[PDB]
Symmetry: C2
């Protein structure tokens, strides 16, 4: 009886090219119809673009606190985010924000951070590193490492088990994850349970296939990336330093890197260098997972206008679930 | 000074995003491709079934509870296997589980480790459906059994300790095809309600000419000739292959409107990769909430094959599928 209907005309019908999802396309359509390119702005002007765009988002419940640490004649501001009904001592992850070294701060990233805390059950420790061009390489990655060391050694002071410590970051913050992990390897600690590199920057080069395919029109442009790198450091030697361009590390330099998750966006100039870095990690014996989220642009999980995109909600839940498993 | 070390030669670099297997997947392929047996499509169904049975046999299973129930629908009996978290007691949401194997291969034991992993990661009960294999049956027997079993759980789930109103659909390969087929029947027949679909490296079209079909046609376990053989055992009818319950990629936007919220996982080095990703794009164009995740370095059935159950990507991918399902079954 059913089989007759199933084979009938009731169910008759009549190239995997990258395209944004409908929700991402709607965001891009307005952006691309707008004005002045970011690389022609001052740092202050560019910072305000992200501040104004992120302002006023609905924040999911979480507990936020603040601590300023003193390390090696340096004050470092931390913002600590915990699940709303947190009790007892929690594992933690450092959180390194994106923004091309020039942009970004805690409020711009707060919704993303809260999403990752909720999905992982772990405390986030945001590091308020000095932006570029006020500082150049390697000021911020040094601050990031020193703050990581402080949490590992003193984390009980903020209710965290510093022995169960991850590193999480988006974009240049994902670069910062790799930079802190490589410092920790060279300096014999602290131990890191897991890295989450969200759509990371991994190389000071602008000629991968994805750089060419998504050069303009996909929110993050090639020229923005060049501007960001120029504000960070114009030194060829710095750009050849694995703490800036971790894609340039050899297999031997990557051996022993922490277990890692890399998320990439299908329509992101940075996609190919993030995926390539994952392949290099695996060749060095590092346990690594690389997930490409189709239809997405760079910073899909950051931009508050995209916070209800189905892929965004799933991707961040999935990053949190992986983190939770590795912080037990 | 600390900066001095960071800018120093200590950190100078000592040292094209081409698809390659991870080291662990390559090790598995080297064992597999070392065998001197004949191609699967030259085997009898029984011989081919034994290949997958043996590949999966003897694996460590993570803790879970397993039970069985045979249901009677429209005069036909359908065997179910029900998998719950080890410490389950209390009503749970559920997902139907449709196994893969090209319609010819597969069963519960071959898929048990995968099913248990998804149950543990999601907290939900799995209801495996023992559909009739091909060529013993052809289209649409198995997808009808799958739909009838789904309807039964929705209406009678209390009998197995499940809230049938919170019901997902999960399957790998042709099982992911079966997810879409059951969802499209449910839309046509006005129920049951489905919270979430998880299509794991699915078959979506009876065509063999996508770029991934050509790039990965041999050497990556699942071959183009295997896929043609599986389809041929399932149905050689052109009309059936043009039916959206067999080739859901051929559905129009209007036919896909209202499909349940969906997660699709694809493997980078899988003939089926492109049709799975293309189906996700079609769902999104029809207003369906859909996430498509490609796992790099993986072959087809990365999450099924027990020799790959300790591959880092596998463990993470299945945890991530379970987390998405948990969020949608609350």
């Amino acid at each position: 009886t059913l089989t007759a209907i199933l084979i009938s005309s009731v169910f008759a019908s009549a190239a995997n090219t990258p395209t944004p999802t409908a929700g991402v396309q709607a965001f891009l359509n307005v952006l691309n119809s707008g004005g002045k390119p970011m690389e022609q702005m001052t740092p202050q002007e560019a910072r305000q673009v992200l501040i104004g765009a992120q302002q006023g988002a609905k924040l999911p419940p979480a507990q936020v606190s603040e601590k300023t640490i003193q390390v090696n004649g340096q004050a470092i501001k931390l913002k600590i985010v915990k699940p709303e009904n947190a009790s007892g001592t929690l594992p933690a992850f450092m959180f390194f924000h994106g923004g091309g070294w020039v942009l970004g701060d805690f409020p711009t990233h707060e919704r993303l951070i809260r999403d990752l805390v909720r999905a992982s059950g772990a405390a986030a420790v945001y590091v308020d590193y000095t932006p570029s061009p006020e500082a150049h390489f390697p000021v911020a990655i040094n601050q990031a490492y020193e703050a990581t060391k402080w949490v590992a050694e003193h984390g009980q002071e903020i209710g965290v088990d510093g022995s169960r410590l991850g590193l999480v970051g988006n974009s240049v913050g994902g670069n910062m994850v790799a930079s802190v992990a490589l410092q920790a390897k060279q300096f014999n600690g602290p131990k890191i349970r897991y890295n989450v590199m969200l759509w990371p920057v991994t190389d000071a080069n602008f000629d991968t296939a994805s750089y060419n395919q998504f050069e303009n029109g996909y929110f993050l442009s090639k020229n923005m990336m060049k501007w960001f790198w120029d504000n960070y450091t114009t030194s060829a030697a710095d750009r050849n330093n694995i703490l800036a361009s971790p894609l340039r590390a050899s297999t031997a330099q990557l051996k022993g890197f922490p277990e890692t998750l890399i998320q990439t966006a299908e329509l992101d100039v940075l996609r190919d260098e993030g995926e390539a870095f994952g392949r290099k990690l695996d060749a060095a014996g590092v346990p690594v997972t690389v997930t490409r989220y189709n239809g997405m642009i760079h910073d899909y999980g950051l931009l508050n206008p995209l916070s209800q995109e189905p892929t965004v909600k799933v991707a961040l839940e999935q990053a949190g679930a992986a983190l939770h498993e590795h912080l037990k």
